[PDB]
Design a protein around this ligand. Sequence first.
Ligand SMILES: Cc1cc2nc3c(=O)[nH]c(=O)nc-3n(C[C@H](O)[C@H](O)[C@H](O)COP(=O)(O)O)c2cc1C
Ligand SMILES: Cc1c([N+](=O)[O-])cc([N+](=O)[O-])cc1[N+](=O)[O-]
Length: 364
Amino acid sequence: SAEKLFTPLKVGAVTAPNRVFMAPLTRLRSIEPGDIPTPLMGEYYRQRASAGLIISEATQISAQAKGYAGAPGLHSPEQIAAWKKITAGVHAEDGRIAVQLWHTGRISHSSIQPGGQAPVSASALNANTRTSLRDENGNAIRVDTTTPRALELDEIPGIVNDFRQAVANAREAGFDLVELHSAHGYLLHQFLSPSSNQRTDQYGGSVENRARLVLEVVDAVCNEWSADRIGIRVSPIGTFQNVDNGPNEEADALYLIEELAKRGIAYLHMSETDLAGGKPYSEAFRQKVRERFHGVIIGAGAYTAEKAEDLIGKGLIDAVAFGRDYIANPDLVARLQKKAELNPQRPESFYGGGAEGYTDYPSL
Ligand SMILES: Cc1cc2nc3c(=O)[nH]c(=O)nc-3n(C[C@H](O)[C@H](O)[C@H](O)COP(=O)(O)O)c2cc1C
Ligand SMILES: Cc1c([N+](=O)[O-])cc([N+](=O)[O-])cc1[N+](=O)[O-]
């Protein structure tokens, strides 16, 4: 039965028939060389086209943005052509799909960077974590992150332009919306957080300076396409991928949100907690966010349909993005609507490999 989860919602330029969204999910099955999406990837997304909105796996805005072997890009002609087939497949099934665009920053390794050089970031501080590469046989492997080089002030306009160009490419690729990856400790978040940003120029220090980059990017992409085509994912509260939001995380978060609201973008996607522990959002905080953003708000992070219904009913959020449940259930919408049991998850195949654990999960 449920209630609001299966009712339409206007999301920027498109209209979702339900509020059950598919969270962006890195699966690392793209073709190398070229970081090219595959027919298998298209099959996978097509199977999940009943989602109110599909948010794609993180996709590189440039070659430099690459941090994981197997992650696709949206910067080359071959990538654009391959993505065009995928979006057409989703649309053939009457679905909607947004491409999540990212620059991994310091969460990368020199071996997959242009020229095999050090990756870039706000400052020259190692992320002290690991990323995923592939071995001689194309199998996914874990490797310690390479220490980054701090972007030169004169290099920032280039980063902004790369996001702008990627969005232009997304539009031609047939995507309905674009979601800027400003969360989980990747490049944009690296600048936002004081723990990963020790810059002394105008891109470091105060929250205004730390949010300068992401806002420049938002303005650039809104100008390139249209504000109602732009979405953004943030993870402003708590600790993620070792990157911790400052000592004034709530205040800084509300500052960022008010700035984003001024651009009138399509939506605000909030990743509430990493994959491990994390303090839950208080309704008081959800209200403060709610009154500051006038577009669609998407909640995410170990959500249950019940929690989604509760929060949507309270008018605090508009939709919910499910990640792992979508990996294992292509027809999650139908299952949640019918209160049917879900397929069990197979974590060992979340990353890399082929069809097994990917297009493997049956629909009702
Ligand atoms: C295999 C896997 C890959 C992920 N890749 C991405 C992604 O590309 N971009 C991102 O923003 N978050 C990513 N996430 C986080 C999910 O979007 C989501 O926020 C998280 O899984 C929590 O939601 P869930 O409990 O419904 O799965 C990933 C998580 C998993 C398990
Ligand atoms: C957000 C995210 C990833 N990403 O694309 O930025 C990649 C991940 N991974 O392990 O490949 C995991 C991510 N996550 O769950 O936060």
